[PDB]
Design a protein around this ligand. Structure first.
Ligand code: HEM
Ligand code: HEM
Ligand SMILES: Cc1cc(N)nc(COc2cc(CCN3CC(F)C3)cc(F)c2F)c1
Ligand SMILES: Cc1cc(N)nc(COc2cc(CCN3CC(F)C3)cc(F)c2F)c1
Ligand SMILES: C[C@H](O)[C@H](O)[C@H]1CNc2nc(N)[nH]c(=O)c2N1
Ligand SMILES: C[C@H](O)[C@H](O)[C@H]1CNc2nc(N)[nH]c(=O)c2N1
Ligand SMILES: [Zn+2]
Lengths: 413, 420
């Protein structure tokens, strides 16, 4: 079997054979497509054996050592551990390879051209939330690099019985608090109201501002999570101004420079790493379109359009569209002026096409989720809009997991 | 399965879909692979290419007649059982059957209703159906098409319509509109290597010249009609210009915009698709409605392999075009789409912006879940090509599945016609 994907702008046709190696479902069936469902729907010894074998096999094939003496002893060694302990431990090389390939396999990520330049921090010796704090602080400092951002991931101990999970309760390492007011309005980031409330309950004293960096809520070994304040000098921020509109700086907008997802689960050869925060750098539209202009978020379209004296009476003036462009210009300009790494959505999607073509040549394909790859503004003037894409699930992979406050059973009376 | 829920991540509305249980054809996807961004993912058709056997055609007929008599609160009624037996005898004696006027109207409206890629479907039941099954020649097809265009244009107050020519018989006597749309502009391949007019239409334009059309060789030359009746060679016809409503594109603030010399036509009229009803195949079924501004202003004007006018507009706007991060393309794209909408509304020509269209579609989805138990929708196609996430459909999960009656793609007739 082969499948072909066409670019309807360039007429280039790629041939995907890599899809023959996927295993978990997409969510779709032969008669219903579920490609726009956001979330479609511990292992025993016998479940773990073939998962481990498949991973080890692919690692040894990647380093051109399949069938070798070291390959066969590694399989036997892993087999022993799963018999002795009902689990096993990745070598350092395998962990690095696994985390890089989970990124390579993330069908929804447009920044994958960089997948092989991932800095992997092995934190599997950590035992306490204080230790997690220290690992995360070093990650942030390394990743931030005074604005010259570097991709990195820090991997905490894997799941054992599910009663001793390591978890970062934060959804990202740097996020701003949201506070609901009695009059029903929201201060700060409305997305983070729930987690802000949890922090306050755990003892956090909130400044109650618009851009309060949340504390880290860190869980080690299945214990109750603990609060820590990231040291403010490690949190790089960019005040947003516009190159033409002097009034833009008067909105008091800023954003943090380091995007760092901390609520995913990294799955490598059947092992589950429930705490694995990873970071890269921003594409402008993530802040400028979604963070600022989603109705559920900072929702600054009307304010900006107001200051542009736009006709907000009817939609066909396209005042929302016009104001959205200006905000995204401001975001890119602000980050670039402060020499904080950022990528615009045109540069990013163009790289992804180069990346995708390269992956089809060397790997036989590239799983990609069009619904997520196409940017949330200006879709069809970017090359990915015209690019057919096949979506399928390869492992190692990043996976969603339940929010920890929905599952944690609290220890302390 | 049992009931698939779709959630809206803005409003938290959850809708429960059971209508997918009636899906008939494959989507292309499997458990292991999703083809939702493939333009033509599936060749699963309900019948062989041409003249089918009794056991091939009759089940599809019975399915459709059953559905239509169920829709009108009969089923098992006298007329329903008589209709089954009459379609049985007709297939026995002609290898096909003929739809009643009511059945034809029901099927056309439901093909539109089932079109998972159409954001305009809130209007589906308000569709004027012109029965043209008595047509025999390309001249008669021309007459039918002129009447359609005149009725549908309605001096700018556009009305949705479909004109249905004779169904396919053996596959050798097809009726076809060779144009992909009733009204499109020519595309001319220049001797240097560039393109004048619309690049999408260069091949069809060449066929028309290769058929005797004298090209005026402008940028907005309305193409002739190339009509094929009963499998004969196609014939050229010039649509009377007074039937072709056009809008000159100007801008409400940029006075220099009108000097770009752009115009567009008012009537979008798809004429290369096939309409499938109860196993019958209507290969010439031109249908029309009215434009969403982005179809002209984003895709027609700004696609790289189309009119590609972004840089020229951005020039007159005095934008930094050195690097992409200045977002000069995004900025011109907004102004162009303001101009298109402002121009149509100024000339009282029906048009809908992408904010109103997508909001209407959300309402249509809710109506359909409430009365039908679902609504097939292709997210890749429903989300507008600009400003995606500030429209409500961006945040709406959708299930995509194939219901019948439906509109289907078909091969371009010059790839398959044996000339006389
Ligand atoms: C280096 C710069 C990077 C850029 C510019 C980038 C860009 C993006 C964007 C725009 C998205 C869509 C996010 C959204 O719309 O909410 C995304 C998703 C994602 N990124 Fe990347 N990313 C980068 C680095 C990374 C790294 C280092 C990792 C992990 C090692 C990663 C893993 C993912 C995953 C797993 C998703 C989608 C999660 C899901 O399934 O929902 N990315 N990325
Ligand atoms: C009345 C106002 C209408 C509006 C605003 C509208 C809008 C649209 C738009 C924007 C698309 C996407 C097209 C593209 O991006 O190229 C579309 C697709 C489509 N429309 Fe509608 N439409 C309307 C009427 C109709 C009617 C009357 C029919 C048929 C009776 C129809 C059938 C279809 C079909 C079949 C497709 C997708 C073809 C495919 O499956 O690839 N539409 N429409
Ligand atoms: C490393 C990196 C760089 C960069 N530029 N952007 C990202 C964003 O990645 C992700 C983005 C989301 C979407 C977040 N919202 C959807 C959920 F409702 C909250 C989920 C996820 F699991 C991700 F991984 C990551
Ligand atoms: C009646 C009506 C009103 C309105 N506003 N828009 C439409 C768009 O219809 C269609 C549009 C297209 C796309 C055309 N080509 C561009 C792509 F590469 C193929 C295919 C198709 F099959 C359609 F049906 C129709
Ligand atoms: C590859 C991709 O499916 C293709 O470019 C699609 C994307 N979405 C679209 N959406 C609409 N409405 N019309 C289109 O032609 C397309 N083209
Ligand atoms: C309903 C729909 O699946 C949802 O809004 C998706 C659409 N595409 C997206 N694309 C990206 N990059 N990020 C998102 O959060 C979403 N949300
Ligand atoms: Zn699918």
């Amino acid at each position: 079997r082969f499948l072909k994907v066409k670019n309807w702008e360039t007429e280039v046709v790629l041939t995907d054979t890599l899809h023959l190696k996927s295993t978990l479902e997409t969510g779709c069936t032969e008669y219903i497509c579920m490609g726009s469902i956001m979330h479609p729907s511990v292992a025993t010894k016998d479940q773990l054996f073939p998962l481990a074998k498949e991973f080890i096999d692919q690692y040894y094939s990647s380093i051109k050592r399949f069938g070798s003496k070291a390959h066969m002893e590694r399989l036997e060694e892993v087999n022993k551990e799963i018999d002795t302990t009902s689990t096993y431990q990745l070598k350092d090389t395998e962990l690095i390879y696994g985390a890089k390939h989970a990124w390579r396999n993330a069908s929804r990520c447009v920044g994958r051209i960089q997948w092989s330049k991932l800095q992997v921090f092995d934190a599997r010796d950590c035992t306490t939330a204080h230790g997690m704090f220290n690992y995360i602080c070093n990650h942030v400092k390394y990743a931030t690099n005074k604005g010259n951002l570097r991709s990195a991931i820090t991997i905490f101990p894997q799941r054992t019985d599910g009663k001793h999970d390591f978890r970062v309760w934060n959804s990202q390492l740097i996020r701003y608090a949201g506070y609901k007011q009695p009059d029903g309005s929201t201060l700060g980031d409305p997305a983070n109201v729930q987690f802000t409330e949890i922090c306050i309950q755990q003892g956090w004293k909130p400044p109650r501002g618009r851009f309060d960096v949340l504390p880290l809520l860190l869980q080690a070994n299945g214990n109750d999570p603990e609060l820590f304040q990231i040291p403010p000098e490690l949190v790089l921020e960019v005040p947003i101004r516009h190159p033409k509109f002097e009034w833009f700086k008067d909105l008091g907008l800023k954003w943090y420079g380091l995007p760092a997802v901390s609520n995913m689960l990294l799955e490598i050869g059947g092992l589950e790493f429930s705490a694995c925060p990873f970071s890269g750098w921003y594409m402008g539209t993530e802040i400028g379109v979604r963070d600022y202009c989603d109705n559920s978020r900072y929702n600054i379209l009307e304010e900006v359009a107001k200051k542009m004296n736009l006709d907000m009476r009817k939609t066909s003036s396209l005042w929302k569209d016009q104001a959205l462009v200006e905000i995204n210009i401001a975001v890119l300009y602000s980050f670039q002026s402060d020499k904080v790494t950022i990528v615009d959505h045109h540069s990013a999607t163009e790289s992804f096409i180069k990346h995708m073509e390269n992956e089809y040549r060397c790997r036989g394909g590239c799983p990609a989720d069009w619904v997520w790859i196409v940017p949330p503004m200006s879709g069809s003037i970017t090359p990915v809009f015209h690019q057919e894409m096949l979506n399928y699930r390869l492992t190692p992979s990043f996976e969603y997991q339940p929010d920890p406050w929905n599952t944690h059973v609290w220890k302390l009376v």
